[PDB]
Coordinates of C-alpha atoms and ligand atoms in Angstrom, one line a residue:
Chain A
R1 CA 29.0 -1.1 -1.9
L2 CA 26.7 -3.9 -0.4
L3 CA 25.4 -5.1 -3.8
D4 CA 27.6 -7.5 -5.4
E5 CA 26.0 -6.6 -8.7
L6 CA 23.1 -5.0 -9.5
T7 CA 20.6 -7.5 -9.8
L8 CA 17.7 -9.3 -8.6
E9 CA 20.3 -12.0 -7.8
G10 CA 22.5 -9.6 -6.1
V11 CA 20.4 -9.0 -4.1
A12 CA 19.2 -12.4 -2.9
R13 CA 22.8 -12.9 -2.1
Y14 CA 22.8 -9.6 0.2
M15 CA 19.4 -10.4 1.8
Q16 CA 21.2 -14.2 2.8
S17 CA 24.3 -12.5 4.4
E18 CA 24.0 -11.4 7.8
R19 CA 24.4 -7.6 7.1
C20 CA 20.9 -7.7 6.2
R21 CA 18.5 -8.3 9.4
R22 CA 16.4 -5.6 8.9
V23 CA 13.9 -5.1 5.7
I24 CA 11.6 -2.4 5.1
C25 CA 8.6 -2.9 2.3
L26 CA 7.1 0.3 0.9
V27 CA 4.0 -0.7 -1.2
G28 CA 1.4 1.0 -3.4
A29 CA -1.7 0.1 -5.1
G30 CA 0.5 -2.3 -7.6
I31 CA 0.7 -4.9 -5.5
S32 CA -2.6 -5.6 -5.6
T33 CA -4.1 -4.9 -9.3
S34 CA -3.6 -8.4 -9.8
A35 CA -6.0 -9.2 -7.1
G36 CA -8.9 -7.2 -8.9
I37 CA -8.5 -4.4 -7.4
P38 CA -7.2 -0.9 -10.1
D39 CA -4.5 1.5 -9.6
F40 CA -4.6 5.0 -10.2
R41 CA -2.2 6.1 -12.7
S42 CA -2.2 2.7 -15.0
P43 CA -3.8 3.6 -18.6
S44 CA -7.5 2.9 -18.9
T45 CA -7.6 0.5 -16.1
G46 CA -6.8 3.0 -13.9
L47 CA -8.6 4.8 -11.7
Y48 CA -8.0 7.8 -13.2
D49 CA -8.7 7.1 -16.3
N50 CA -12.6 6.1 -15.3
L51 CA -14.0 9.3 -14.0
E52 CA -15.5 11.1 -16.8
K53 CA -19.4 9.6 -15.8
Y54 CA -18.9 11.3 -12.0
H55 CA -18.5 14.6 -13.9
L56 CA -15.4 15.9 -11.1
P57 CA -13.6 18.7 -11.6
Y58 CA -10.5 16.8 -11.1
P59 CA -9.9 13.2 -11.2
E60 CA -8.4 13.2 -7.6
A61 CA -11.2 15.3 -6.5
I62 CA -12.9 12.2 -5.8
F63 CA -10.4 11.6 -3.2
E64 CA -10.1 14.7 -1.7
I65 CA -11.5 16.1 1.9
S66 CA -13.2 19.1 1.2
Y67 CA -15.1 18.0 -1.9
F68 CA -16.0 14.4 -0.3
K69 CA -17.5 16.7 2.8
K70 CA -19.4 19.1 0.0
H71 CA -20.3 16.0 -2.2
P72 CA -19.7 12.6 -0.9
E73 CA -22.2 11.0 -3.5
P74 CA -19.5 10.6 -6.2
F75 CA -17.0 8.7 -3.8
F76 CA -19.6 6.5 -2.4
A77 CA -20.9 5.6 -6.0
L78 CA -17.1 4.4 -7.0
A79 CA -17.2 2.4 -3.9
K80 CA -20.0 0.2 -4.8
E81 CA -19.0 0.1 -8.6
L82 CA -15.3 -1.0 -7.0
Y83 CA -15.8 -3.2 -3.6
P84 CA -14.5 -6.5 -4.7
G85 CA -16.3 -9.7 -4.2
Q86 CA -13.3 -11.4 -2.6
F87 CA -10.3 -10.2 -0.6
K88 CA -7.8 -12.5 -1.4
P89 CA -3.7 -11.3 -0.9
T90 CA -1.4 -11.8 -3.8
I91 CA 2.0 -13.4 -4.0
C92 CA 3.7 -10.2 -3.0
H93 CA 1.5 -9.9 0.4
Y94 CA 2.3 -13.5 0.7
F95 CA 6.3 -12.6 0.3
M96 CA 5.9 -10.1 2.7
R97 CA 4.2 -12.2 5.2
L98 CA 7.6 -14.8 4.5
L99 CA 9.7 -12.1 5.6
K100 CA 7.8 -11.8 8.7
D101 CA 7.7 -15.1 9.1
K102 CA 11.7 -15.4 8.9
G103 CA 12.3 -12.3 11.2
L104 CA 13.7 -10.2 8.2
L105 CA 10.8 -7.7 8.1
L106 CA 11.3 -4.7 9.8
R107 CA 8.0 -2.8 8.6
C108 CA 5.6 -2.5 5.9
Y109 CA 4.7 0.8 5.1
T110 CA 1.2 0.6 2.8
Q111 CA -0.7 3.1 1.1
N112 CA -3.1 0.4 0.4
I113 CA -7.0 0.8 2.4
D114 CA -7.6 -2.7 1.2
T115 CA -6.8 -4.3 4.2
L116 CA -4.7 -7.1 2.1
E117 CA -1.6 -7.0 4.2
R118 CA -3.6 -8.2 7.3
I119 CA -5.2 -10.3 5.3
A120 CA -2.2 -11.8 4.6
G121 CA -1.1 -12.5 8.1
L122 CA 0.6 -9.0 8.9
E123 CA 0.2 -7.8 12.6
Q124 CA -0.4 -4.5 13.6
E125 CA 2.9 -4.0 15.0
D126 CA 4.3 -4.6 11.6
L127 CA 2.3 -2.4 9.2
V128 CA 2.4 1.5 9.2
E129 CA -0.7 2.0 7.2
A130 CA 0.0 5.4 6.0
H131 CA -2.9 6.3 4.4
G132 CA -5.8 4.3 6.7
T133 CA -7.7 1.6 6.1
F134 CA -11.2 0.6 4.1
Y135 CA -12.0 -1.7 7.4
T136 CA -13.3 0.6 9.8
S137 CA -15.0 4.2 9.4
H138 CA -16.0 6.9 11.4
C139 CA -18.4 9.9 11.6
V140 CA -16.5 13.3 10.6
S141 CA -17.3 15.2 13.6
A142 CA -14.1 15.5 15.5
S143 CA -16.6 16.1 18.8
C144 CA -18.5 12.3 18.1
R145 CA -16.4 10.3 16.3
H146 CA -18.9 7.6 15.9
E147 CA -17.3 4.0 14.5
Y148 CA -18.8 2.3 12.4
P149 CA -17.7 -1.0 10.8
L150 CA -17.4 -2.2 7.3
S151 CA -20.9 -4.0 7.3
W152 CA -22.5 -1.2 8.2
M153 CA -20.9 1.4 5.0
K154 CA -21.0 -2.2 3.0
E155 CA -24.9 -1.6 3.4
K156 CA -24.9 1.9 3.0
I157 CA -22.8 1.7 -0.2
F158 CA -25.0 -0.8 -1.9
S159 CA -28.4 0.3 -0.5
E160 CA -27.2 3.4 -1.9
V161 CA -27.4 5.7 0.9
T162 CA -25.0 8.0 1.7
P163 CA -23.8 7.0 5.4
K164 CA -25.0 9.2 8.0
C165 CA -23.7 9.3 12.1
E166 CA -27.2 8.1 14.1
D167 CA -26.0 10.1 16.6
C168 CA -25.5 13.8 15.3
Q169 CA -26.3 13.1 11.2
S170 CA -22.8 14.1 9.9
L171 CA -21.1 12.0 7.4
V172 CA -19.6 8.8 7.8
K173 CA -16.4 8.7 6.2
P174 CA -14.0 5.6 5.8
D175 CA -11.1 5.5 7.6
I176 CA -8.9 6.4 4.6
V177 CA -6.7 9.0 4.7
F178 CA -8.2 11.1 1.7
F179 CA -6.0 13.8 0.0
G180 CA -5.2 17.1 2.6
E181 CA -5.9 14.7 5.3
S182 CA -3.1 14.3 7.7
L183 CA -0.9 10.8 7.9
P184 CA -1.5 9.3 11.6
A185 CA 1.1 9.8 14.1
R186 CA 2.3 6.6 14.0
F187 CA 3.8 6.8 10.4
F188 CA 5.9 9.5 11.9
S189 CA 7.2 7.5 15.2
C190 CA 8.1 4.1 13.2
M191 CA 10.1 6.0 10.5
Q192 CA 12.2 8.0 13.2
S193 CA 13.7 4.8 14.2
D194 CA 12.5 2.4 11.5
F195 CA 14.8 4.3 8.5
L196 CA 18.4 4.7 11.1
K197 CA 18.1 1.1 11.3
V198 CA 17.0 -0.6 7.5
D199 CA 19.2 -2.9 5.5
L200 CA 17.0 -2.6 2.9
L201 CA 14.7 -1.4 1.0
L202 CA 12.2 -3.3 -1.2
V203 CA 9.8 -0.7 -3.2
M204 CA 6.8 -2.4 -4.9
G205 CA 4.2 -1.7 -6.8
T206 CA 3.8 2.1 -6.5
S207 CA 4.8 5.1 -8.6
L208 CA 6.2 7.6 -5.6
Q209 CA 4.4 10.8 -6.6
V210 CA 2.3 11.1 -3.3
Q211 CA 4.2 13.3 -0.6
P212 CA 5.3 12.5 2.2
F213 CA 4.7 8.6 1.4
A214 CA 7.6 8.6 -1.5
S215 CA 10.2 10.7 0.9
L216 CA 10.8 7.6 2.6
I217 CA 13.1 6.3 0.0
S218 CA 15.7 8.7 1.0
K219 CA 15.3 8.5 4.6
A220 CA 17.2 5.4 4.7
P221 CA 21.1 5.5 5.1
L222 CA 23.3 6.0 1.7
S223 CA 24.7 2.6 2.3
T224 CA 21.3 0.4 2.3
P225 CA 20.5 -1.2 -1.0
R226 CA 16.8 -0.3 -2.4
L227 CA 15.1 -3.0 -4.7
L228 CA 12.4 -1.8 -7.4
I229 CA 9.7 -4.2 -8.2
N230 CA 7.4 -2.4 -10.4
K231 CA 6.0 -2.3 -14.3
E232 CA 7.8 1.2 -14.3
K233 CA 10.5 2.5 -13.3
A234 CA 10.0 5.3 -10.5
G235 CA 11.7 7.5 -7.6
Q236 CA 14.1 8.6 -9.8
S237 CA 14.9 12.5 -9.7
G238 CA 18.2 11.3 -3.0
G239 CA 16.4 9.7 -5.2
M240 CA 16.8 6.3 -7.3
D241 CA 19.9 5.9 -9.8
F242 CA 19.5 2.9 -11.6
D243 CA 21.2 3.6 -14.7
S244 CA 23.9 6.2 -14.4
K245 CA 28.2 6.1 -13.5
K246 CA 27.3 6.2 -10.1
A247 CA 25.0 3.8 -9.8
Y248 CA 25.7 1.7 -6.6
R249 CA 23.1 0.3 -4.8
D250 CA 19.4 0.8 -6.4
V251 CA 17.8 -2.0 -8.5
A252 CA 14.7 -2.1 -10.9
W253 CA 13.1 -5.1 -12.0
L254 CA 10.6 -4.5 -14.2
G255 CA 7.5 -6.6 -14.6
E256 CA 4.6 -8.0 -12.4
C257 CA 5.1 -8.0 -8.6
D258 CA 4.0 -11.0 -8.2
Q259 CA 6.2 -12.6 -10.8
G260 CA 9.0 -10.7 -9.6
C261 CA 8.2 -12.0 -5.8
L262 CA 8.4 -15.4 -7.5
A263 CA 11.5 -15.1 -9.0
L264 CA 13.4 -13.1 -5.6
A265 CA 11.6 -15.9 -3.4
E266 CA 13.3 -18.9 -5.8
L267 CA 16.5 -17.2 -6.1
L268 CA 16.6 -17.3 -1.9
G269 CA 15.3 -20.9 -1.5
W270 CA 11.8 -19.8 -1.0
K271 CA 10.0 -20.9 -4.2
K272 CA 8.4 -23.8 -2.8
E273 CA 7.6 -22.2 1.1
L274 CA 5.7 -19.0 -1.2
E275 CA 3.8 -21.6 -2.9
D276 CA 2.4 -23.6 0.0
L277 CA 1.9 -19.9 1.5
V278 CA -0.5 -18.4 -0.9
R279 CA -2.2 -22.2 -1.8
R280 CA -3.2 -22.7 1.6
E281 CA -4.0 -18.9 2.7
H282 CA -6.4 -19.1 -0.4
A283 CA -7.6 -22.3 0.0
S284 CA -8.4 -21.0 3.8
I285 CA -10.1 -18.0 2.7
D286 CA -12.2 -20.0 -0.4
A287 CA -13.2 -22.5 3.1
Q288 CA -14.4 -19.1 5.1
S289 CA -16.5 -17.9 2.0
Chain B
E1 CA -1.0 23.3 12.7
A2 CA -1.2 19.5 11.9
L3 CA 1.0 16.9 11.0
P4 CA 2.0 16.5 7.1
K5 CA -1.0 16.1 4.8
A6 CA -1.6 13.1 1.8
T7 CA -0.6 15.9 -1.3
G8 CA 0.0 14.7 -5.1
Ligands
LIG301 C1 -2.5 11.4 0.9 C2 -3.3 10.1 0.6 N1 -3.7 9.6 -0.2 N2 -2.9 8.9 -1.3 N3 -4.0 8.3 -2.1 C3 -3.4 7.5 -3.1 O1 -2.8 8.1 -3.9 C4 -1.1 7.2 -4.4 C5 -1.6 6.4 -5.5 O2 0.0 5.9 -5.7 P1 0.2 4.2 -5.8 O3 -0.6 3.5 -4.5 O4 1.7 4.2 -5.8 O5 -0.5 4.1 -7.3 P2 -0.9 4.7 -8.6 O6 0.1 5.8 -8.6 O7 -1.4 4.4 -9.6 O8 1.2 3.5 -8.6 C6 0.7 2.2 -9.4 C7 2.2 1.8 -9.6 O9 2.2 0.4 -9.7 C8 2.6 0.1 -11.1 N4 1.9 -1.4 -11.3 C9 0.3 -1.4 -11.2 N5 0.4 -2.9 -11.1 C10 1.2 -3.5 -11.1 C11 2.5 -2.6 -11.1 N6 3.7 -2.8 -10.9 C12 3.6 -4.6 -10.8 N7 2.7 -5.4 -10.8 C13 1.6 -4.6 -11.1 N8 0.7 -6.0 -11.1 C14 2.1 1.1 -12.3 O10 2.6 1.0 -13.1 C15 2.3 2.2 -11.6 O11 4.0 2.5 -11.3 C16 -1.3 6.1 -2.5 O12 -0.7 7.1 -1.5 C17 -2.6 6.0 -2.6 O13 -3.0 6.2 -1.0 C18 -5.3 8.4 -1.7 C19 -6.2 8.2 -2.4 C20 -6.9 6.6 -2.0 C21 -8.1 6.6 -2.6 C22 -8.8 5.0 -1.9 C23 -9.6 4.1 -2.0 C24 -10.3 3.6 -3.9 C25 -11.9 3.4 -3.7 C26 -12.2 2.3 -2.7 C27 -11.8 1.0 -3.3 C28 -12.3 0.3 -2.0 C29 -11.4 -1.3 -2.1 C30 -11.6 -2.5 -1.5 C31 -5.0 9.5 -0.8
ZN302 ZN1 -21.6 11.9 15.0

């Protein structure tokens, strides 16, 4: 086994060894809830528990592409209701930024569309935005593909006018990979090389229920340690094995992503670095307001 | 016919 003990401190010591050079992060909505952007599965607060008003056949229909193309108004109403007053990345995003700054980050595969990874300073090469982004939008006509910015989209969303393409009058959709849409080719290009050379998987803020993203946890070599930082266990059935007698590489830190990243950063000797990074960047954002 | 799709 590569971990000396199945704890956060053991993962930290492994990350300080020379064997751990390439770290892949797999993140979901949980790493952004502390930024005011709700998740999907959490009781009461999750999006799937707050869609009775939109009168949908099933909660996921508001995020399914065929439903959107038939009835886009519920999605854009929900978007107006959820559009954040401020885009501030979390301590978890800035922990990934520290991984980048120290040359340890091979890739961040994110399921989120909030661009907080970019805002925290992760560059395009560092990112697999597996499910797209809200930042750009496109006409849904494949022979048109007129691109519209977040300003145009946000204006149409708050004026409660359904976004329509100025050239062919088709629907304009944010560049989110809705359910039923294919993931970008970059996902499948990166995975091929990334998961042959990964030394540590860091899974944060995801329930690991949406495919093909969840399957990524089984693409790593069997020796590669995997650390989950999440309010609840996830990815158990090559699934996650935290508790069995055969457990050897999977560690679950149950709690807030921000708290677990603070603790791991402190165990690595990065407490003050992460604090300064968060302070400076949140100040820069509050200044550019 | 297409690359793998986002599915719950
Ligand atoms: C196919 C494609 N697609 N996808 N999608 C979605 O789905 C999914 C989901 O998953 P996730 O991300 O993982 O999430 P959930 O399930 O909810 O889970 C979460 C998790 O985490 C946790 N937590 C929470 N919080 C917390 C935690 N932990 C720690 N810490 C903290 N703080 C819980 O417990 C659980 O486990 C994915 O993939 C996604 O992507 C889709 C859909 C999309 C949609 C979008 C849009 C929305 C609206 C708008 C918004 C705007 C903003 C700016 C598709
Ligand atoms: Zn068009």
